[PDB]
């Protein structure tokens, strides 16, 4: 009862058969989630659309992922991944930002319990690749405690609304290193031209930052 | 491409946009030369009422007359707009019903 | 892969070679006329040079050669 089910795709698949010619079947993709981090998806196939609905939703609850959420409202860090030809770039966002994402990602995020996130889907917009690509990326996000344990350092959050106050979000459970993390004068991290073009204001699009209903 | 190649070639140049049959204008005035019907390309079947007009630019063109029933005749004045008739190959102009000598379609 | 794109190119080249074959005598008369105009256009470009420089005739001993003839 704690889980809600959402449909992501309903397709009519047509199979050519040796004796009966073209037959019509239904392939359905549905996602399930309880709104508290536990969510999954499953494909359903049947001749009837309502039998497919039963199969997918019942199967989905046996293949649940657990998704880590920062402060139970957003992701822990920016996630950029490709699944086959579908690229998904997700950005950690503060409270009140809402879900400004592909409509399917919005639906999936409500099942997981993510309230604030930006996502951009490029390349092939294949619902299945998008769904399993999204769950693969959300299931491999490192939390702040995992980062602290891995590096044996404090994770300190600086918020502009709180000024210079250092907020320790995670501390290592084991011993605490004494040697500061090396300060590379210039990081060799790969950047997204879309993010840089935006930060500089060179990104002008009539479709970006449009007024939309609360999501 | 490499950064050196992107620098050497410069920013992309858009193809100059192609003016349509109205020559980048919302409407054109025309003089009716002849009226006739055209057969739509398959699978469509109809006798679509069209006309040949001399546009104010001087070029002659075939224009579709929308609506059920028209009274256009040679030497009459019509206003033509853009928009292709999807099933009539080559017909890219449409007569404006209710302007100059082309009146509104008579009800039922 | 299929050869359907090659087949389109194949027919285009066959019909072109056949078209050139049928009209090779007209095309030869047209080509001759173009080379004459090309030579005249070349002679004018050289005449423009000495005339715009203040000379009234071609430099002493200068004869414009025929640079487009088969010879």
């Amino acid at each position: 009862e704690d889980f809600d089910t959402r449909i992501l795709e309903v397709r009519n698949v047509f199979t050519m058969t040796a004796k009966e010619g073209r037959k019509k079947s239904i392939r359905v993709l549905v996602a399930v989630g309880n709104g508290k981090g536990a969510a999954g998806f499953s494909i359903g196939k049947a001749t009837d659309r309502m039998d497919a609905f039963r199969k997918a939703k019942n199967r989905a609850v046996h293949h649940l992922h657990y998704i880590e959420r920062y402060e139970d409202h957003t992701i822990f860090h920016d996630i950029s991944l490709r699944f086959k030809r579908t690229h998904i770039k997700m950005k950690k966002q503060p409270k009140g930002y809402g879900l400004r994402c592909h409509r399917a990602i919005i639906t999936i995020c409500r099942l997981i319990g993510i309230k604030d996130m930006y996502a951009k889907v490029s390349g092939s917009i294949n619902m299945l690749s998008l769904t399993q690509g999204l769950f693969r990326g959300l299931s491999r996000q490192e939390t702040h405690q995992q980062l602290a344990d891995k590096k044996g350092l404090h994770v300190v959050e600086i918020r502009e609304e709180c000024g210079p106050l250092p907020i320790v979000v995670a501390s290592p459970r084991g011993p605490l290193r004494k040697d500061p993390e090396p300060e590379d004068e210039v990081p060799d991290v790969k950047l997204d031209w879309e993010d840089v073009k935006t930060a500089q204001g060179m990104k002008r699009s009539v479709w970006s930052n449009l007024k939309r209903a609360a999501t | 491409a490499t950064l050196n190649q992107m620098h050497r070639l410069g920013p992309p140049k858009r193809p100059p946009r192609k003016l349509g049959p109205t020559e980048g204008r919302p409407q054109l005035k025309g003089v009716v030369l002849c009226t006739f019907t055209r057969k739509p390309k398959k699978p469509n079947s109809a006798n679509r009422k069209c006309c040949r007009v001399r546009l104010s630019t001087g070029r002659e063109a075939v224009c579709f007359i929308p609506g059920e029933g028209h009274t256009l005749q040679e030497h009459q004045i019509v206003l033509v707009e853009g928009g292709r008739t999807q099933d009539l190959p080559g017909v890219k102009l449409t007569v404006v019903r209710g302007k100059y000598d082309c009146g509104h379609v008579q009800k039922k | 892969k299929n050869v359907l794109k090659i087949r389109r190119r194949k027919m285009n080249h066959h019909k072109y070679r056949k078209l050139v074959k049928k009209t090779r005598f007209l095309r030869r008369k047209v080509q001759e006329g173009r080379l004459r105009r090309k030579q005249i256009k070349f002679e004018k470009d050289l005449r423009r040079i000495w005339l715009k420089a203040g000379l009234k005739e071609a430099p002493e001993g200068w004869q414009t050669p025929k640079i487009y003839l088969r010879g």
């Binding site: 004068e185 210039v186 990081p187 950047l191 840089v196 930060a199 | - | -």
Partner: protein, 168 residues
């Protein structure tokens, strides 16, 4: 993703992080560095990381690079007076090279603060004009003043349509 290694270098944020603003005397800066050798590593990183920042802050200073012309790397500055400043950079890190030339030929933080203040005098708050040059376009935007007729109509007595009608 952005092409090349260290794509951060090709961002306006990175290029504006240079702290070396040369004095007006500096006209030309030549960089002689070596492609190989452990002792010229700072000079290679200086050319790789900092020459773009120096040029961004000093667009009118000519910067010319020379590879493997001499056994050791060095910087040479040409001043408008005709003086030349040779800076040996062999064995120095790129951060020390930037700190060195800032000390000997860079404007101090005080000299730069003053210039920023003189620029603020150019945009006077009391001036009215286009939003490009002025905070406000018209006095009607000031609360308490007679608002714009486009937003609030004026009394018939303050309108010329009716002043002449009564007078005429």
């Amino acid at each position: 993703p952005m092409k090349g290694r260290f794509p951060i270098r090709r961002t306006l944020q990175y290029l504006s992080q240079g702290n070396v603003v040369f004095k007006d005397s500096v006209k030309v800066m030549t960089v002689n560095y070596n492609t190989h050798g452990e002792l010229g590593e700072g000079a290679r990183k200086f050319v790789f990381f900092n020459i773009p920042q120096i040029q961004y802050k000093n667009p009118w200073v000519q910067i010319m690079m020379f590879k493997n012309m001499t056994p050791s790397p060095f910087l040479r500055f040409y001043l408008d007076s005709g003086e030349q400043v040779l800076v040996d950079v062999e064995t120095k890190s790129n951060k020390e090279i930037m700190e060195h030339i800032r000390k000997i030929l860079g404007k101090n933080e005080e000299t730069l603060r003053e210039e920023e203040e003189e620029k603020k005098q150019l945009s006077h708050p009391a001036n009215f004009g286009p939003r490009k040059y002025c905070l406000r376009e018209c006095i009607c935007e000031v609360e308490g003043q007679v608002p714009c007729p486009s937003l609030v109509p004026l009394p018939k007595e303050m309108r010329g349509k009716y002043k002449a009608a009564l007078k005429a």
